[PDB]
């Protein structure tokens, strides 16, 4: 890798460590063994009563997840400035790339805090079990299990934060998002990031030279995961009278898929 490329990879990496609340190194430290375990209705309510000393438990959970989304949206917007060319793009194209990319990035990064038994929540202070989420009443029990299925395979790739930062940058740089005005410049931006991702993976993972095509397929998987998630969110929005959607997230979903 040329010093410029090698340096650009570090640039991306440092912006990822700087802007994102959680990262894989820290998550693994906490998960290695002290997070309060949410494994049933009793422990969920105990955990809630920590913050609010009426709505169904499923709906409370539905709204906590949204707060994590809003926060990650803000962090991703700042992260994106480190991508060579992004800040030089038309303002509307920036909005378009982030609108379509944020949820793909969200589910990619949530894998870092997930293992086969559950996931870290509430800024590392809670661990909610996979089985508890499966026990929620339909259709809320169908929200997270596809995310766990994705994460277990994604985590099997054994990426580190230096790979993931580039992967997330690559996600944001997809030149085939609908409504992009300056498609040609975005494709050049994408080609540059994917170029850095490709070379970095070869350097960082000599034991798996097929990691790059595996990750391209995970990008396609994430796109389908997001489409299906948005559909389930919409169904919960229309049915379920107590389920509200944060206005920033509504605008993300609006006219998306
Ligand atoms: C259903 C909405 O899905 C979102 C996308 C989305 C899906 C799962 C998610 O897992 C966040 C972690 N988690 C789960 C899995 C249950 C409860 C929490 C939790 C507990 C306490 C806190 S304290 C702030 C924060 C979160 C995060 C974002 C969207 O569409 O925006």
Burial code (b: 16+ CB inside 10 Å, e: under 16) for 193-212 equals bbebbbbbbeebbeeeeebb
Nearest Cα neighbor of 246 from 73, 91, 53, 109 is 73
Q: Is 253 annotated as a binding residue?
A: yes
Residues lining ligand 1, CB < 6 A? 61-62, 64-69, 106, 119, 121-122, 126, 128, 143-144, 233, 249
Technique employed here was X-ray
**Substitution site in 20, 21, 30, 65 for ligand 1 pocket (most atoms within 8 Å of beta carbon):** 65
Tally of CB atoms within 10 A around 100 = 22
Bond prior to 139 in cis (omega within 30° of 0): yes
Q: Give ∠ CA 5-74-227 in degrees, rounded to 5.
A: 85
Q: Which domain range does residue 189 map to? A: 1-257
Q: Which atom of ligand 1 is nearest to the CA of 236?
A: 1
Q: What span, in angstroms and rounded, lies between the C-alpha atoms of 133 and 155?
A: 20
Tokens of 118: 């559950």
How many angstroms separate the Cα of 152 from the Cα of each of 60, 230, 238, 243, 247?
26, 21, 31, 29, 31
Q: How far is the CA of 141 from the centre of ligand 1 (A)?
A: 13
Nearest CA to ligand 1 atom 24: 122
Structurally, how many domains does the chain consist of? 1
Beta bridge partners of 127: 37, 120
């Amino acid at each position: 890798m040329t010093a410029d490329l090698k340096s650009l990879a570090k640039r991306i990496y440092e912006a990822y460590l700087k802007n994102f609340n959680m990262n894989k190194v820290k998550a693994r430290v906490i998960l290695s063994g002290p997070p309060f375990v949410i494994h049933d209705m009793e422990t969920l309510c105990m955990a809630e009563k920590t913050l609010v000393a009426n709505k169904e438990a499923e709906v409370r959970i539905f709204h906590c997840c949204q707060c994590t989304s809003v926060e990650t949206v803000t962090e991703l917007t700042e992260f994106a400035k480190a991508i060579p060319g992004f800040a030089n793009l038309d303002l509307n194209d920036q909005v378009t790339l982030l609108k379509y990319g944020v949820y793909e990035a969200i589910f990619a990064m949530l894998s870092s805090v997930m293992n086969k038994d559950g996931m870290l929540v509430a800024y590392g202070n809670g661990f909610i079990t996979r089985e508890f989420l499966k026990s929620l009443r339909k259709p809320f029990c169908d929200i997270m299990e596809p995310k766990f299925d994705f994460a277990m395979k994604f985590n099997a790739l054994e990426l580190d934060d230096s790979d993931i930062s580039l992967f997330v940058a690559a996600i944001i740089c997809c030149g085939d998002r609908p409504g992009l005005l300056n498609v040609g410049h975005i494709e050049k931006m994408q080609e540059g990031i994917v170029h850095v991702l490709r070379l970095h993976l070869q350097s960082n993972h000599p034991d798996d030279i097929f990691l790059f095509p595996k990750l391209l397929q995970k990008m396609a998987d994430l796109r389908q995961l997001v489409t299906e998630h948005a559909q389930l969110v919409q169904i919960i929005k229309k049915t379920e009278s107590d389920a509200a959607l944060h206005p920033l997230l509504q605008e993300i979903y609006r006219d998306m898929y």
